């Protein structure tokens, strides 16, 4: 499963209308990994389903150890098109008229699994399309052993979400 000293990344974007569990891959820099189909959940998805999704998204997270792999993964035109494509889908699927509508109440929770620990970080919604760890104190992280039940992971995600800051 998860390898020693290997980082696995997932981010959850939550609006009042949906919950999106997203595998991020990379190395230092990470990005939504377009290999994997999205994992969109109902905003009120139960803890266990959410936990299972998060663990699976984490399992898909790749460490781009190959240089050319990294360079290709983060190609600016490709990154730009993927993100734009990302926005388009969400807007179309949930009927957001503008990007702002999509983003204005979007929370982001970062999930990081390395070694024995899952770290769930609330974020500060600093600009419409930016979430920062600034102004989130380390103490607000939800830390869970990696072997937590899917339900505890789901519950822990909900806890972190409650700690996101915005506006």
């Amino acid at each position: 499963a998860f390898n020693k000293d290997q980082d696995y990344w997932a981010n959850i974007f939550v609006t009042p209308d949906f919950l999106s569990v997203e595998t991020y891959s990379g190395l230092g820099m990470t990005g939504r990994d377009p290999l994997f189909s999205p994992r969109l959940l109902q905003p009120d998805v139960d803890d266990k389903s959410l936990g299972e999704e998060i663990l699976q998204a984490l399992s898909d997270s790749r460490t781009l150890d190959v240089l050319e792999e990294r360079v290709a993964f983060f190609d600016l035109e490709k990154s730009k098109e993927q993100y734009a494509a990302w926005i388009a889908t969400l807007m179309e699927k949930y009927g957001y008229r503008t990007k702002r509508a999509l983003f204005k109440n979007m929370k982001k929770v970062g999930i990081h699994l390395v070694n024995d620990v899952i770290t769930i970080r609330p974020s500060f919604h600093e600009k419409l399309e930016a979430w920062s760890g600034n102004r989130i104190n380390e103490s607000d992280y939800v830390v869970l052993p990696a072997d937590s039940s899917p339900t505890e992971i789901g519950s822990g995600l909900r806890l972190a979400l409650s700690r996101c800051k915005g506006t």
Binding site: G31, G110, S132, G133
Partner: peptide, 13 residues
């Protein structure tokens, strides 16, 4: 790669 920053389908870790 630390406080994280998430922007445009990317995150600085």
């Amino acid at each position: 790669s630390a406080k994280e920053y998430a922007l445009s389908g990317r995150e600085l870790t």
